[PDB]
Design an enzyme around this catalytic site. Structure first.
Site: not given
Ligand SMILES: CCOP(=O)(COc1ccc(C[C@H](NC(=O)O[C@H]2CO[C@H]3OCC[C@H]32)[C@H](O)CN(CC(C)C)S(=O)(=O)c2ccc3c(c2)OCO3)cc1)OCC
Lengths: 99, 99
Positions: A25-27
């Site tokens: 996860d690059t984000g």
């Molecule tokens: C079983 C599935 O459950 P789910 O659907 C949710 O699952 C998830 C799947 C993937 C991720 C990874 C997250 N991606 C995302 O938010 O993507 C959304 C937009 O596209 C969609 O696709 C996936 C979700 C939707 C980002 O890559 C990374 N994030 C930071 C970004 C700037 C936002 S971070 O994780 O907040 C984070 C990680 C490490 C850190 C931090 C913050 O701070 C310091 O360290 C989270 C949850 O519902 C549950 C309620």
């Protein structure tokens, strides 16, 4: 290897003696893993994203093998919906984005 | 280009004619932008992240230029912490992960 992004970039990792699936996860600045009982001291932390914040336990100097590549760094443990490998470890395995 | 991950992978994007900064995010399935005015019809949608679910506006077939590469696809607008480019558009510009 080369990982395309048609599907979620899920890979096998080894941590604390256990094999798990995790997202490259690059984000993510930090690496966040599903609830697990790791030995040693830790510090409370809160991390935020879409939907708000979760409470995690911060462990330092943790060894993770990511597709056969070794990395050592901070690992956050908590009720995350998915295991996330963040930039702090991706840099160690020499991961880049290419387009 | 080849983008390393010691810093956040921020890039300039062009959307609705305006330039913005956004994070290339391989752990996002979908592209989510902070509140902005976008022309076109939209529908209410819900999207989930690390902290739970949020309400967004879903705009379909939107033109967006990412570092000068054109994409046309779905853009969600709502209360994300940062503008994120997800796999739905990363795939259109030919992005892969490599290590
Ligand atoms: C079983 C599935 O459950 P789910 O659907 C949710 O699952 C998830 C799947 C993937 C991720 C990874 C997250 N991606 C995302 O938010 O993507 C959304 C937009 O596209 C969609 O696709 C996936 C979700 C939707 C980002 O890559 C990374 N994030 C930071 C970004 C700037 C936002 S971070 O994780 O907040 C984070 C990680 C490490 C850190 C931090 C913050 O701070 C310091 O360290 C989270 C949850 O519902 C549950 C309620």
């Amino acid at each position: 290897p080369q990982i395309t992004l048609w599907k979620r970039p899920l890979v096998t990792i080894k941590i604390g003696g256990q094999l798990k699936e995790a997202l490259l996860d690059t984000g993510a600045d930090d690496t966040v893993l599903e609830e697990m009982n790791l030995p040693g001291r830790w510090k409370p932390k809160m991390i935020g994203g879409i939907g708000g914040f979760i409470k995690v336990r911060q462990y330092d100097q943790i060894l993770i093998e990511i597709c056969g590549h070794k990395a050592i760094g901070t690992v956050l443990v908590g009720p995350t919906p998915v295991n996330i490998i963040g930039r702090n470890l991706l840099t160690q395995i020499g991961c880049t984005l290419n387009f």
